[PDB]
Swiss-Prot record, chain A:
Source organism of the structure: Thermus thermophilus (strain ATCC 27634 / DSM 579 / HB8)
Protein name in UniProt: Small ribosomal subunit protein bS16
SUPFAM superfamilies assigned to the protein according to its UniProt record, in alphabetical order: Ribosomal protein S16
InterPro entries: Ribosomal_bS16, Ribosomal_bS16_dom_sf
NCBIfam families listed in its UniProt record: S16 (TIGR00002)
Subunit structure: Part of the 30S ribosomal subunit.
SS bond list: none
Presence of keyword rRNA processing: no
GO molecular-function term, one example from the UniProt record: structural constituent of ribosome
Cellular component, GO annotation: cytoplasm; small ribosomal subunit
UniProtKB/Swiss-Prot annotation, chain B:
UniProt record similarity statement: Belongs to the bacterial ribosomal protein bS20 family.
Entry-linked HAMAP family: Ribosomal_bS20
PANTHER family: 30S RIBOSOMAL PROTEIN S20, SMALL RIBOSOMAL SUBUNIT PROTEIN BS20C
Superkingdom of origin organism: Bacteria
Pfam families per UniProt: Ribosomal_S20p (PF01649)
Stated name of the protein: Small ribosomal subunit protein bS20
GO terms for MF: small ribosomal subunit rRNA binding; structural constituent of ribosome
SUBUNIT field: Part of the 30S ribosomal subunit.
Record has Signal as a keyword: no
NCBIfam families, A to Z: S20
Segments of this protein annotated with the region Disordered: 1-25
Annotated source species: Thermus thermophilus (strain ATCC 27634 / DSM 579 / HB8)
Keywords: Ribonucleoprotein, Ribosomal protein, RNA-binding, rRNA-binding
UniProtKB/Swiss-Prot annotation, chain C:
Gene Ontology cellular-component annotations: small ribosomal subunit
Family (UniProt): Belongs to the universal ribosomal protein uS4 family.
Cofactor(s) listed: Zn(2+); [4Fe-4S] cluster
Protein name: Small ribosomal subunit protein uS4
Matches recorded under Pfam families: Ribosomal_S4, S4
Stored InterPro entries: Ribosomal_uS4 (IPR022801), Ribosomal_uS4_bac-type (IPR005709), Ribosomal_uS4_CS (IPR018079), Ribosomal_uS4_N (IPR001912), S4_RNA-bd (IPR002942), S4_RNA-bd_sf (IPR036986)
Keywords assigned: Metal-binding, Ribonucleoprotein, Ribosomal protein, RNA-binding, rRNA-binding, Zinc
Positions with a binding annotation for Zn(2+): C8, C11, C25, C30
Functional summary from the UniProt entry: One of the primary rRNA binding proteins, it binds directly to 16S rRNA where it helps nucleate assembly of the body and platform of the 30S subunit. Binds mRNA in the 70S ribosome, positioning it for translation.
MF GO annotations: metal ion binding; rRNA binding; structural constituent of ribosome
Cofactor note: Binds 1 zinc ion per subunit. In a number of structures (e.g. 4Y4O, 5FDV) a 4Fe-4S cluster is seen in place of the zinc cofactor.
UniProtKB/Swiss-Prot annotation, chain D:
Classification lineage: Bacteria, Thermotogati, Deinococcota, Deinococci, Thermales
Superkingdom assignment: Bacteria
Protein name (database record): Small ribosomal subunit protein uS17
A Pfam family recorded for this sequence: Ribosomal_S17
Keyword Ribonucleoprotein: yes
Amino acid sequence: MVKIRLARFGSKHNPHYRIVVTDARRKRDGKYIEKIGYYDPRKTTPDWLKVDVERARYWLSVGAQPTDTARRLLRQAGVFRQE
Amino acid sequence: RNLSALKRHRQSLKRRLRNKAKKSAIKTLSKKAVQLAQEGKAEEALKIMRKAESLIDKAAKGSTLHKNAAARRKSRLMRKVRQLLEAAGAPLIGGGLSA
Amino acid sequence: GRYIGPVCRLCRREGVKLYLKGERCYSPKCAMERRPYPPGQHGQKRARRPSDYAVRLREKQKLRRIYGISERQFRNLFEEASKKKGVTGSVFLGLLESRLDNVVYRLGFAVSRRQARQLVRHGHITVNGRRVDLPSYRVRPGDEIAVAEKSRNLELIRQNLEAMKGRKVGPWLSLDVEGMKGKFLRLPDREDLALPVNEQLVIEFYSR
Amino acid sequence: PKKVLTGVVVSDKMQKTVTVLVERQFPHPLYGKVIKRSKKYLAHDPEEKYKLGDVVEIIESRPISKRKRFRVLRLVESGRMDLVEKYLIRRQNYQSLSKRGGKA
RNA sequence: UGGAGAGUUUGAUCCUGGCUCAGGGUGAACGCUGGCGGCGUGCCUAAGACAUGCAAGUCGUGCGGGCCGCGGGGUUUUACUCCGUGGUCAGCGGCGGACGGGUGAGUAACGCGUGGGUGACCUACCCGGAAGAGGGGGACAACCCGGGGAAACUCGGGCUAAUCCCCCAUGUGGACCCGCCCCUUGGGGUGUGUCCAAAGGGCUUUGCCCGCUUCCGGAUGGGCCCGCGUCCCAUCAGCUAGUUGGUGGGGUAAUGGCCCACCAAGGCGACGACGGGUAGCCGGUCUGAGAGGAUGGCCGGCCACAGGGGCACUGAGACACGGGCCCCACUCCUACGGGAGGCAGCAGUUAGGAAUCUUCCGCAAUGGGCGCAAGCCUGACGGAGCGACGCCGCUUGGAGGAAGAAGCCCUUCGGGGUGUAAACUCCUGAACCCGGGACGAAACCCCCGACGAGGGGACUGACGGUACCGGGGUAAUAGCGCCGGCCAACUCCGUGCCAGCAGCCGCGGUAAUACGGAGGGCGCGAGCGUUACCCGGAUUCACUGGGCGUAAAGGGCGUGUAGGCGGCCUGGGGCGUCCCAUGUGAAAGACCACGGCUCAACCGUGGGGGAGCGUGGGAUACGCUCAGGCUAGACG
Ligand SMILES: [K+]
Ligand SMILES: [K+]
Ligand SMILES: [K+]
Ligand SMILES: [K+]
Ligand SMILES: [K+]
Ligand SMILES: [K+]
Ligand SMILES: [K+]
Ligand SMILES: [K+]
Ligand SMILES: [K+]
Ligand SMILES: [K+]
Ligand SMILES: [K+]
Ligand SMILES: [K+]
Ligand SMILES: [K+]
Ligand SMILES: [K+]
Ligand SMILES: [K+]
Ligand SMILES: [K+]
Ligand SMILES: [K+]
Ligand SMILES: [K+]
Ligand SMILES: [Mg+2]
Ligand SMILES: [Mg+2]
Ligand SMILES: [Mg+2]
Ligand SMILES: [Mg+2]
Ligand SMILES: [Mg+2]
Ligand SMILES: [Mg+2]
Ligand SMILES: [Mg+2]
Ligand SMILES: [Mg+2]
Ligand SMILES: [Mg+2]
Ligand SMILES: [Mg+2]
Ligand SMILES: [Mg+2]
Ligand SMILES: [Mg+2]
Ligand SMILES: [Mg+2]
Ligand SMILES: [Mg+2]
Ligand SMILES: [Mg+2]
Ligand SMILES: [Mg+2]
Ligand SMILES: [Mg+2]
Ligand SMILES: [Mg+2]
Ligand SMILES: [Mg+2]
Ligand SMILES: [Mg+2]
Ligand SMILES: [Mg+2]
Ligand SMILES: [Mg+2]
Ligand SMILES: [Mg+2]
Ligand SMILES: [Mg+2]
Ligand SMILES: [Mg+2]
Ligand SMILES: [Mg+2]
Ligand SMILES: [Mg+2]
Ligand SMILES: [Mg+2]
Ligand SMILES: [Mg+2]
Ligand SMILES: [Mg+2]
Ligand SMILES: [Mg+2]
Ligand SMILES: [Mg+2]
Ligand SMILES: [Mg+2]
Ligand SMILES: [Mg+2]
Ligand SMILES: [Mg+2]
Ligand SMILES: [Mg+2]
Ligand SMILES: [Mg+2]
Ligand SMILES: [Mg+2]
Ligand SMILES: [Mg+2]
Ligand SMILES: [Mg+2]
Ligand SMILES: [Mg+2]
Ligand SMILES: [Mg+2]
Ligand SMILES: [Mg+2]
Ligand SMILES: [Mg+2]
Ligand SMILES: [Mg+2]
Ligand SMILES: [Mg+2]
Ligand SMILES: [Mg+2]
Ligand SMILES: [Mg+2]
Ligand SMILES: [Mg+2]
Ligand SMILES: [Mg+2]
Ligand SMILES: [Mg+2]
Ligand SMILES: [Mg+2]
Ligand SMILES: [Mg+2]
Ligand SMILES: [Mg+2]
Ligand SMILES: [Mg+2]
Ligand SMILES: [Mg+2]
Ligand SMILES: [Mg+2]
Ligand SMILES: [Mg+2]
Ligand SMILES: [Mg+2]
Ligand SMILES: [Mg+2]
Ligand SMILES: [Mg+2]
Ligand SMILES: [Mg+2]
Ligand SMILES: [Mg+2]
Ligand SMILES: [Mg+2]
Ligand SMILES: [Mg+2]
Ligand SMILES: [Mg+2]
Ligand SMILES: [Mg+2]
Ligand SMILES: [Mg+2]
Ligand SMILES: [Mg+2]
Ligand SMILES: [Mg+2]
Ligand SMILES: [Mg+2]
Ligand SMILES: [Mg+2]
Ligand SMILES: [Mg+2]
Ligand SMILES: [Mg+2]
Ligand SMILES: [Mg+2]
Ligand SMILES: [Mg+2]
Ligand SMILES: [Mg+2]
Ligand SMILES: [Mg+2]
Ligand SMILES: [Mg+2]
Ligand SMILES: [Mg+2]
Ligand SMILES: [Mg+2]
Ligand SMILES: [Zn+2]
């Protein structure tokens, strides 16, 4: 099914992923459907994680299945925080 | 060597057989009703047309015909029968056709 | 492989005096006093009217031999300058003038640019409190260039920074001699520098 | 949108099918001067409704046959062989350039 | 924000004109030389041939067994036999094996690009909604018994479970025929007739979970169709019979000569058909002032292919690289009957070649498959290795001080040069089996909560003892090309049209800045040169931006076909043309800004531009077209 996962974009030893919405079958760094965030595993800057939660919510509403690590990050930005 | 997923080949043959057999019936019954309809024998032509209809749908129950392949068949069948019965037919058993 | 070879001989070939030793290139010994003529078995022979190319080439060699940079890095900067907005000539001289090793020389933390280079490579210098051992590190306005505490007590750093007491510093810079600190106030203007160089001839050299 | 083109009927010799010659004008990609180019289309005509000289509007349609993906959307103006003749002569022209040749 | 030219035809000149050089580039190779690191990058030839290992499996929460083992039952005892549980094997069944990975052979084509069409369509798993799962029946492996073969492997007989297969039922609904209505290609509603559903499993077992069935929709993915665009040769000019169309049928998810039967005689071409050559196309890349030229490696998108050819089976999906069948070529086993194979997956071998790497580490991270989960698989990937192949950074010292050399090697023999240069005095301190030592990794899981939201919790690092920090600490690689002009750098000796140099002009015939050596000099520097190829200079195919009296170039002349071009006035239309709005123009790249690694290369975030095409609206001077008029062209 269509997923919400990470796509590698940094450099050697300098990873930077894109929180992406793509068909499960594509290369990971392949052609996605829509970028909805980005993540810096090493927090090299204060802005090491952003997520268009409105959009994340959209895709989930239509079947988007997040990777575990994908889900984990989305949550960290309150994609599920209904509180 | 020895890729145990040759079990798929193994299985395909069993399936091939299943499908193959279901179709023969379908083809054979259809021809049979189309044959009767034409010969003007209405009540039995429909009787069989009805079996063929059922068999076809069932074929599409699983992966033998599925899709709209079933629909085409029934369509062409109910087509030829109703028409061939244009020899003074008069749908006796009013089987599958809805006059 | 930053050159490394006899220096008070480049000045001789360049006609003008290139202070590439700081000290001594002042004393009655810089050779430019006795033998201002180019080096070699023909250095004194009659001069032959140089070609347009010659003029431009020598001028580029002068400006670049001053900062002791490679032709590679030198060219890289010039290209970066052509691309930037603003009179290439100046902008170029600005960038040159922003190399840390250079600024360390302007602040007097060292006699020559060559000496200032070694002082960076050896970590005796600090930008904003953090060590920077890259002679080409580009200093930006506001950055405070200093001397690592551990180096502050170095015999050389003493004689040097001492000799800077009550001594003047370029208008785009500023140094607190005591604390051994210095600030890069802003990019020097063409007017702020006074080098024996017609940078226009250089721009032309890289237009051929 | 399904494409709509306008052309002249230059052929009627087919059952339920007419050949529509469509013209197109445009500046040359490198030389500028506006140049006329054209293509013949085989539009579908169920009622044999159109004849030569007929200027019609061809509409992009679901394939009716190989070499035939358009239907005659309507007539723009009737009879006018000035166009048919033109086409025909250019064709007759070919009846030359080879090994033999006419006299035109 | 953007555009330099020079050498060479003459005794000299101007012009024409070709050749050549200065610049930038390359998946490079070769020569001399070679220290450190980061990031990239590395079979361009034989889509030649391949040993070996690994590269796709996973579910015991769908099912029944075999082998090996332990435990517990029914007996007075044994035999026999019941239950539980562990290891293991495959089998039945399911999902995956159609992705991910490789390559560029074929292809000049709806293959690709761009913009559209589908009332002519499909889409497993995922998401939302509605409805449902009553009853019965069957078989084949496993296993057991027997037969054949050298082997691969195979034939028969018997038994058996299921989420395997079938029958009947229920019919939310859906499919088909006919009618009607609304819509307009096969879209939607409706009525009658007919036809079509299902599977169970797991428990914290009396409600939850995983799953099953039918239907409508969503999402993602895809098929097919269409306008426009896409190399060279016209010393290829005619091409075509399923060929063009029709009717009916077949086939498909679906349109269609896609295929077939019959009918018609059509279709295509100079706006280049047909044929030949060559070639995957694109985002982009290199170059250029631009227009343009050239190109398509790495990365992303699409296509094609999996030893060569043909074919279908199974599937939601393939006509399937590690599935199947046949033909061919080749290798292998053969008891000669007959079998087994396909690295254009990672690594490696061999061949060819000027030339292209480790039979490496890890599954820790991102991603993928299966599973309720634990977890299993993953040569995809993340890393390390090798190669100056590229880009960036960095070192071989810094500051002070002129022995001064048998010989190298200049001279007017007074001196000049190498040169502040100098294993020689002072400073710092690359290297360096010395201390500490990482981010990348917090999820799945567990518990509380309600398997939700929240909240706490074990666990896990290949890279790596690496980076980085702190301590100590040595003065510690330099080479290559060139020095007649273009073109930066000149003298001695040697040689004597020789030996040789040479990009072009040329140099050497006894004073050679041109050969070879030496001193000196210029350029660049872990590189420097060479060869090859691309753009440039070349307005030297000229659209921007050229020419033809004598330099190359007016057709021997005419006639006229196609085509190109078209006087003055008015009106319609609004095709060309122009304007507005809007959609599209993926990401990457490029540009600008800020930011992370000590800088940079490299990377991250954000910003701006944009032709072309689609849609809607508008303008009408000019060009076009239609209509009318004129008389200055033309003709009479
Ligand atoms: K002809
Ligand atoms: K038995
Ligand atoms: K009904
Ligand atoms: K659906
Ligand atoms: K769709
Ligand atoms: K589509
Ligand atoms: K037909
Ligand atoms: K460019
Ligand atoms: K291009
Ligand atoms: K191309
Ligand atoms: K799952
Ligand atoms: K240290
Ligand atoms: K030394
Ligand atoms: K001699
Ligand atoms: K010489
Ligand atoms: K060229
Ligand atoms: K002539
Ligand atoms: K002639
Ligand atoms: Mg299996
Ligand atoms: Mg039969
Ligand atoms: Mg500038
Ligand atoms: Mg007709
Ligand atoms: Mg000449
Ligand atoms: Mg000459
Ligand atoms: Mg002459
Ligand atoms: Mg001459
Ligand atoms: Mg003369
Ligand atoms: Mg010339
Ligand atoms: Mg070597
Ligand atoms: Mg490397
Ligand atoms: Mg290859
Ligand atoms: Mg090979
Ligand atoms: Mg493995
Ligand atoms: Mg067992
Ligand atoms: Mg098993
Ligand atoms: Mg692939
Ligand atoms: Mg190819
Ligand atoms: Mg061809
Ligand atoms: Mg297209
Ligand atoms: Mg399937
Ligand atoms: Mg559902
Ligand atoms: Mg049973
Ligand atoms: Mg058996
Ligand atoms: Mg049996
Ligand atoms: Mg079933
Ligand atoms: Mg109902
Ligand atoms: Mg039923
Ligand atoms: Mg249950
Ligand atoms: Mg048909
Ligand atoms: Mg059909
Ligand atoms: Mg199919
Ligand atoms: Mg055909
Ligand atoms: Mg090819
Ligand atoms: Mg040009
Ligand atoms: Mg450019
Ligand atoms: Mg690619
Ligand atoms: Mg091969
Ligand atoms: Mg094949
Ligand atoms: Mg099938
Ligand atoms: Mg396969
Ligand atoms: Mg294929
Ligand atoms: Mg293989
Ligand atoms: Mg290999
Ligand atoms: Mg060889
Ligand atoms: Mg993993
Ligand atoms: Mg994973
Ligand atoms: Mg370097
Ligand atoms: Mg000396
Ligand atoms: Mg020194
Ligand atoms: Mg010391
Ligand atoms: Mg952490
Ligand atoms: Mg609980
Ligand atoms: Mg939590
Ligand atoms: Mg784990
Ligand atoms: Mg120290
Ligand atoms: Mg010179
Ligand atoms: Mg000789
Ligand atoms: Mg001589
Ligand atoms: Mg010489
Ligand atoms: Mg040109
Ligand atoms: Mg012109
Ligand atoms: Mg000319
Ligand atoms: Mg002549
Ligand atoms: Mg002539
Ligand atoms: Mg003439
Ligand atoms: Mg004419
Ligand atoms: Mg006119
Ligand atoms: Mg005209
Ligand atoms: Mg008009
Ligand atoms: Mg218009
Ligand atoms: Mg636009
Ligand atoms: Mg883009
Ligand atoms: Mg920075
Ligand atoms: Mg930066
Ligand atoms: Mg960006
Ligand atoms: Mg418009
Ligand atoms: Mg108007
Ligand atoms: Mg008008
Ligand atoms: Mg008129
Ligand atoms: Zn000096």
